[PDB]
Amino acid sequence: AHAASYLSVGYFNGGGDVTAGPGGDINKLDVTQITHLNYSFGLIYNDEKQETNPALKDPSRLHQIYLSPKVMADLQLLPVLRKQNPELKVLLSVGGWGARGFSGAAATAESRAVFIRSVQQVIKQYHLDGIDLDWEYPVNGAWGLVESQPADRANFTLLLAELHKALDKGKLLTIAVGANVKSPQEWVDVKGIAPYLDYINLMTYDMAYGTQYFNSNLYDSKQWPTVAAADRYSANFVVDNYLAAGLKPAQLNLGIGFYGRVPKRATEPGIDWDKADAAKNPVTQPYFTARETAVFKAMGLDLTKDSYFKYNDIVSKLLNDPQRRFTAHWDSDAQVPYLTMKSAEGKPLFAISYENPRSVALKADYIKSKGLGGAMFWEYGADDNNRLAHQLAESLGI
Template identity: 30%
Template sequence: MAIIAGVLAGCGVHDMKPPRNTAHYRVVGYDTAKGDIAPQDVGKIDTLIFAFARLVDGEVILPPADAMRLDRLVALKASHPRLSVVVSVGGWTVDGFSDAASTAANRQRFADSAARLLVANGADGLDVDWEYPGHTEAHIKASAQDRGNFTLLLKDLRETLDHAGNAHGRHAARHYTLSIAAADGVFVSGIDIAAVEPSLDWFNLMTYDFVNSMTPTTGHHTGLYASAYAPGSARSTDKAVRQFLAAGVPSQKLLIGAAFYGRAFADVQPAHDGLYQAYGHYQGEYPWPQLKAGFINRGGYIRYWDEVAQAPFLWNAATHCFISYDDPQSIAAKATYVKSHHLGGIMYWEQSEDPQGELLDAVWRGLQPGRPE
């Protein structure tokens, strides 16, 4: 395996105007609406997913402050009519899904509240981020019935959103969309992928956080392929895609994830420059601007490129600190992968972690028609 040190591969930002047509490769970004998006960046995004609506007593709601943040995103459609704004409900540690999906009455209550929220706020669809059906890693309630109930919940949502769309003149291409944020590996065991697929417009594959504070070693937290040093159980973007394709999901419904942040580990064992090694403690997350300003080829950190995994990482030999992240080079590789496998596009977390639009620009450029596959 060739792993070489080098400088960050750069690419220009904001020196191309977005085309009118980005073909079928979609750019979908989660946005916590912490700040404004530059106009030239909005034109590169197909769908913004507002994170998050809340689940309270089985209903999807937006407190007034959150509704104001969502309104800022919806207002962007006035000058960017092709932009869609979707509302995501849930997120890590958000409880209540198991109960909300447990009975027909509860499922309909959830669906009706979601439809009302979309209509009232001028949004274009719903994203369900239940992490995860049948699992308690996030310290939420789970049930052995979650798998079947999740299928029923999404069916009820699909029917209810279509009914609401018909009542408000939203048909065909303008119908209310329905997506889910989905993990891979064992974390998707609580989902009947083949059964939920017909209800969904697309899957947001969370192909990041493969290593984190809960895993025993470092590694590529958002690697495209498995590293030569990774154990057989290691997760990767390619492995996730193959899992969902094998379950019968059409390739165009799969959007792979890009991370606009890095994950850092301290007191790491030094073999292989810290790659897939035991560590003393998890150090935290760093957004892309902070990685550029303080870590990439700075302060003793050296950027390495894993040719097999198609992923960068940082290693500080003096302090034994390791950081895994996405950058323009790895995002370009992901875009090439999307095209060669005829996937739907790229999703990313999260808009505010790339305020200058550099990583977004890499996503958008890589997905342009005519670029090499």
């Protein structure tokens, strides 16, 4: 007689993203398929010396939120989206991969107050239901991609506490957190911040690095196993790490990638940093040759720079490749699909893993069985005719 309610929180790369590229078309989204939209991204005016976005270096706006023209214009369509789905909640996500300014914004009482005032101003001007902070990452700085300091852990908590106090009742405060095991251990006081957050979005993807083949495997592959311990990740492992650190499952949304990645293992030696004279003794070697890298290059994917491939492009360019160069497979342990390309020798080479309707439904089944609060996905612009979002909505009963 009583039915559970799951969330489906769809990121949309509207403004542009360092790794996913230019922003998409908000008009193509089906907002009836989701519960929450994270419009991405607000940026942060900052004094980091390595900032290359000159707009963000305006010293009169230090620590405030920056909204690009495209972001402003898209946020103007909110009334139309709300008419199509009057239950929809819309948040602005601030930060994203490579986004500077959190370490400075969070550092002092005065800096925190400026940031918070800016958050309040943006919520009010654009009539948002809340704010999502996507700081990559406190303390670690994504290994120097953004400035960081050890005080970031404590300061993130203070920032969230003070933002929670400032926000109107009813406004949502959320964050996205990293897959890396050091996130709950060292970077983010997850127990400390939990009281201030409506939910926590887990970035349970981007695992196709180092000696790992799969990008968003639910469990570890056995057929295509990761070699170095420090690289061995799955969505469930991440979930378990956050739960071990003291978060309740109902507060968590599992991140689902509407995209795939060509693993780094295909093109770069894989180093196990636990081994003797590690860099001279790689534990995997690249298996792509110029023949393979050229196929991807011709698609528009330069594997020396990036490995991201949107799901709609996987369908149109890989699955439906007129020359039939890609073969689709299912990994029964990892519960995701992957494609192989045939080497000149005739051997299948592992090309890319991704998510399809079947694997999305299996992640929804995990959400339901593990007792998580819902799904989050990156990102709506990468879906194919809203099919993966619709699958998620069907499987979660949204």
